[PDB]
Amino acid sequence: ENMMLFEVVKMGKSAMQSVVDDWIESYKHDRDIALLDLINFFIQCSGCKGVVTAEMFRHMQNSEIIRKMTEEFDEDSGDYPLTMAGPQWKKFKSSFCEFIGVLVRQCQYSIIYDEYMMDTVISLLTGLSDSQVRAFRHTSTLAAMKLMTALVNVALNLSINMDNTQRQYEAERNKMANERLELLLQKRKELQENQDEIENMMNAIFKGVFVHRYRDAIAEIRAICIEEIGIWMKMYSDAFLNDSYLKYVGWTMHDKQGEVRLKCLTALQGLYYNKELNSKLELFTSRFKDRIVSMTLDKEYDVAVQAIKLLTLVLQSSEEVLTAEDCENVYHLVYSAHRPVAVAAGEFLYKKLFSGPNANLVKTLVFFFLESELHEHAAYLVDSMWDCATELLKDWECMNSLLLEEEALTDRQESALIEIMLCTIRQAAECHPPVGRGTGKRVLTAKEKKTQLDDRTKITELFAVALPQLLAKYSVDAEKVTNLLQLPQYFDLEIYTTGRLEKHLDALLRQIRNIVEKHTDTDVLEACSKTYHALCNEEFTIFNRVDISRSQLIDELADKFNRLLEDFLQEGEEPDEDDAYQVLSTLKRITAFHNAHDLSKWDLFACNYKLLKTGIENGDMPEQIVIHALQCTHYVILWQLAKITESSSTKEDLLRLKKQMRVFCQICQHYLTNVNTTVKEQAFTILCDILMIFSHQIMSGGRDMLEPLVYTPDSSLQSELLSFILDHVFIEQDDEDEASKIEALHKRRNLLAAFCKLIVYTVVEMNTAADIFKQYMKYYNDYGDIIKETMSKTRQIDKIQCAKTLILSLQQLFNEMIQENGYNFDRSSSTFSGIKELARRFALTFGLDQLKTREAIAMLHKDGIEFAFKEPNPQGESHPPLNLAFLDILSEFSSKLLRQDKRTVYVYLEKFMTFQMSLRREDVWLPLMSYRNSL
Amino acid sequence: KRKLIVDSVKELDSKTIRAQLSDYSDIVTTLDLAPPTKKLMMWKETGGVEKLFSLPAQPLWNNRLLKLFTRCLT
């Protein structure tokens, strides 16, 4: 094998300089043999299993050698060493390049000038670079570009040696040894000769290879060329950093492949990180600044990251090139979904505008947040700066002092600062980015965990002391309290006792009580309830104080609720709207807490049932009161179910719970038909939850005691739930605004999920899912993921009934078509086309990897056939059966039947097919013939 | 034929490069914003198929209750 040099450079595990020296030794003796082996090395590096012979080298031209090597390539595939995956080939690329460079640099004082080695190598590489064989062109271009950068290093060494020789010549002249001056001039002449030869070789490779291969059809080759021209401009700036070499990067940063724009930006970075302040570079940047700024939004995120980083380096260079509009465009990217871009923009912003002491920095961040009409909250702004401005962001003492102590601060700015502070505290306690910015999940470093604990304790201390003050100051603003009340949920609660801080805990509870009895906003009450839940941890010594305050607040609220309902529901008094608002505020405060707390000791089922049954019997009951009473009764029932676990619960207690739930279900069924949309929605959601909790699965996990509590919905109730889904989830399209539509779509998606949970957990007949499955392509972009999870779980449950329900869906679509169009409908229309497309996508949900599929698919055909021949023509046997067209849909499933099953399906089709039909081959009968041919 | 890769066209002509300089509109895009509001962020967290099918339609702020619902899954 002539694979010596190739194999060595591939897996030699040997310093390239030793191999290069060995080759130069082979050269010194027999130059031609060494050069032939070098040629064959390049050829084999291109994956060529061919071999150039001595006779060829002697008597053949480059074109002929290339043609013969192409013919004798003897390839097994389209692969060549530079497109192979794996480390054993990336190392090959590295070794190839290192070898080229070391060869050149080691020949640079003698062999490089013999006018033999380099001309040969450059001719060969040029030829291979102008070949249509991609392996040859790719390889030869890489080789030639590495060779050129080595030549550049050589020419730079020569320029240095010439400067030093000129210095010595000047020195010796100043001395006046005339002989030594003449000798120095002769050395100057020799060095200029060498400079000229090196320039010739560099110009050769540049003109014969680069100017063509930088624009190669293959993007990878363009990338090679741009990477290396960047290297040249970086390493010999004095020679290669001019327009004559920068226009190439200018043009290529418009390439249509991100692989190439990336290399352009990285080359320009490498030129700007020198911080040598070039003027040629400044004018090039002036010319292509708009292009770079636009690339901050490149379709490839990597490219945008690098464009931002290049703009940062440009700032460092000079803050005079970029206009305000440019910098604002870069700022807007901190709110981007992709984190790399967001932190690049965050570094840009920090360096441009953010460069105790950290006071006015906070004011500037708040002004920026408010000037940014792109995000109403601050989680993502915070996360963008987390890397470059951790100090400023964790300086919570400065934030609290700004909010409390005392132009000053506005209300907008106080709200914004509260928001930013809450975000920083959340990302400090929680050591992960907000959703959509998190790069998966990982284990925190020891340092990260210690920082987590330190930050957690700082927060606990500071805000255990300050939050009562903040609450008091902004007790009346709803956003501010809603946010501030989320702070205790990150505390280390033990510090309340180990820190002698119970006084501030009492102050906080009192501020919370004042906020509750003073507010009605649902978010405020949500925060109050969840924070009270957070503080009442049974594994902390402060449990009893907070439990006492909680019980007192519940006592007050329940007393006021009973007293308000004693007058609101009096058959005489016709309540006003303000009496209703009072009752509603009390009920809201009660419900928010009954969700996250066990108020079974207050037996609020009575009041809520009375409210709901009054609403039913009278038909006039404010919506909000109705929905909150529904929620509160839901929570009462769930909490009682929670307390039933222990066998210490009485039998009469379980009977009480069962009857309460049984009547609550009828109440929710009554409200499901209400005229108010949101009331119907609330009833539906609570019904779906109750039906899941009380499904047979209630007794699954050794919970046999729970056998009597199982609740199965009526057929009427099943149909009512499905009808609500059909009327509310599946609505028209188009082809407020963004906010209203996304809100509505998320609400309806949760509804559909609530019903599909009942389906996939067999709480309702699987057949109902047909009405949903049929809506999979028409509502794909909205509900398709949910519908598809439903299909998957139903298949995994009972593939056979899944297929039966699928064919029922297609049958419903078919009956609906014939209803709207008619029994003489056109089979070339868009409706029938769409139905058979849905049938195709349905068919691809099978596969014989699971044997059961066979029977399943078989059933799908049986039923199918039975539906196509169900209703006959009013004329009789001489006219097609009404649902005959359905067969043309069923054929989309023949691609999943097996050779054995096709015959059985055919025999079952003969049970319905007659001879007079089998012969019929006119137009209207073509669906049957097609379905037959499929089998 | 041969599994060897042979490009028929090796270069992009000059006119297509002038075209690339004139119009890069197809290699840039709009700012893909992150959830702009708190609600939309919560919904991004809890609005997928897995979460939706593994959580109750009426949220339960106490695990003591949410377990009553999650019990009935498989």
């Binding site: 792109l374 779509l745 909205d782 993921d785 | 893909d32 992150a34 991004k44």
Partner: peptide, 13 residues
């Protein structure tokens, strides 16, 4: 302009 892809479920195909 700027846009939020609110439909993080139609993302797939």
């Amino acid at each position: 302009k700027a846009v939020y892809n609110a439909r993080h479920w139609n993302h797939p195909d």
